[PDB]
Structure formats: C-alpha cells, structure tokens
Design a protein around this ligand. Structure first.
Ligand SMILES: O=C1OCC/C1=C\Nc1ccccc1
Ligand SMILES: Cc1cc(C(F)(F)F)nc(N)n1
Length: 207
C-alpha cells in the first residue's frame, strides 16, 4: 500500500467541502453520475476506431448500489476506467481541473452546487462520505483501489479480490447522519431531479 499527499489546493478544496455549512448535499449523486457518463463517453468514443477496447465489456451503463448494513452507497460504471497514473493524477492533483477557479468563485459568492462546472465534482462525495474508496480498471492497466478519509492523504494499492472487467466503482462510506441516501425513494427522487437526461441506463439496485 502506497500513501500519497494530496496537492495542497486539493486538500484545501476537500477541507472546504467538509467544513462549509451547506445543506444541499444531494448534488453529490449528480456529480458522480456525470463523471460516470463522461467516462462512458470516452470508452464509447475510443471503441469506434478500436472494437477490441470492448473485449472487457460491451455494456455501457451506470449502477447505483445502496447497502444499509455496510452503510455504503456505490456508484458503478463500465466507463474507460483509470490507469494507476490516471488515478493518482486525477484524484490527487489539480491536473486539468478548475480547482483554483472554484475556490476563488466560492469567495466571490459562488455556490458549492456549481462544483461540477470546475471539473472537481468528484470531491462532492465528501459532502456525505467520511471515507471514499475508488476501485478502477482501465484496459491498459491492472485493477487498483484508491482510498481517502481526507486529512490530506490517500492510499493506492492493487486490488485483486474481485475483478471488474473495466470501469470505475466509487464507494461512499456515508456519515452517520447521511443515511437518507440509502433510501430507495430518496435515490430515485435525486436521479429524477438531477440526472434524468443522462444518456446511459442508470439501474438502482434493490437491497
Ligand atoms: O470530478 C473530478 O475531480 C477530479 C477529477 C474529476 C473527474 N475526472 C474525470 C476523468 C474522466 C472521466 C470522468 C471524470
Ligand atoms: C474514468 C473515471 C474517472 C473518475 C474520477 F476521476 F472522477 F474519479 N470517475 C469516473 N467515474 N470515471
């Protein structure tokens, strides 16, 4: 298991997300689903010129899996996935995101719900999760598990327990007071409200 430090600005963004009083937390689902859709667009596009890219799975979809027993909500997609480098760069650094602009925006009156317009929607997961585990598999690399409870660091390790063909799984270990997001009616309401136009099937698993 390798431990990494988030780039300063990313740690600062996470702190803002976790400590800022903001009740409209439900937008976290919209942001993760949007990331999955983008990931699906990528593999869809690449498969146009190279059909073998789908040998790891032709189905392009998004699955929502609540589990009250483990108190987790998992967003799974069969998108492009992330190589080890992609994981570390995408989640541990500013990279191509608008992290800087977002933080400045918040001081200029912007709202946290606007996070997705700055390429950092993933971090909205910390509005409801105390810990986030990301399992991912890209055609060009092995399966990896990224994990962080914030605090300035994250870990990365190989993941062999259960292979996932291709894609990304975002496991949200919910805060004790955010279990409403495990309720079927609540999840359906949120998807219909913010993700009704996603161009891939979204299946809500029953417990
Ligand atoms: O929300 C986010 O915060 C950091 C990176 C990111 C999203 N990156 C990404 C890359 C490929 C497909 C979908 C999302
Ligand atoms: C390829 C990819 C990257 C991300 C993240 F970077 F936002 F985590 N999320 C998904 N779903 N898929």
């Amino acid at each position: 298991v390798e431990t990494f430090a988030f780039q300063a600005e990313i740690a600062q963004l996470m702190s803002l997300i976790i400590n800022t009083f903001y009740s409209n937390k439900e937008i976290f689902l919209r942001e993760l689903i949007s990331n999955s859709s983008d990931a699906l667009d990528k593999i869809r596009y690449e498969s146009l010129t190279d059909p073998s890219k789908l040998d790891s799975g032709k189905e392009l979809h998004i699955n929502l899996i609540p589990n009250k027993q483990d108190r987790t909500l998992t967003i799974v997609d069969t998108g492009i996935g992330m190589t080890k480098a992609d994981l570390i760069n995408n989640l541990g650094t500013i990279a191509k995101s608008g992290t800087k602009a977002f933080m400045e925006a918040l001081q200029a009156g912007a709202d946290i719900s606007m996070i997705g317009q700055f390429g950092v929607g993933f971090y909205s997961a910390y509005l409801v999760a105390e810990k986030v585990t990301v399992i991912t598999k890209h055609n060009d690399d092995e399966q990896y598990a990224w994990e962080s409870s914030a605090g300035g660091s994250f870990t990365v390790r190989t993941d062999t327990g259960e292979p996932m063909g291709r894609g990304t799984k975002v496991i949200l270990h919910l805060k004790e007071d955010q279990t409403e997001y495990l309720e079927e009616r609540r999840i359906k309401e949120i998807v219909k409200k913010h993700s009704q136009f996603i161009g891939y099937p979204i299946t809500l698993f029953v417990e």
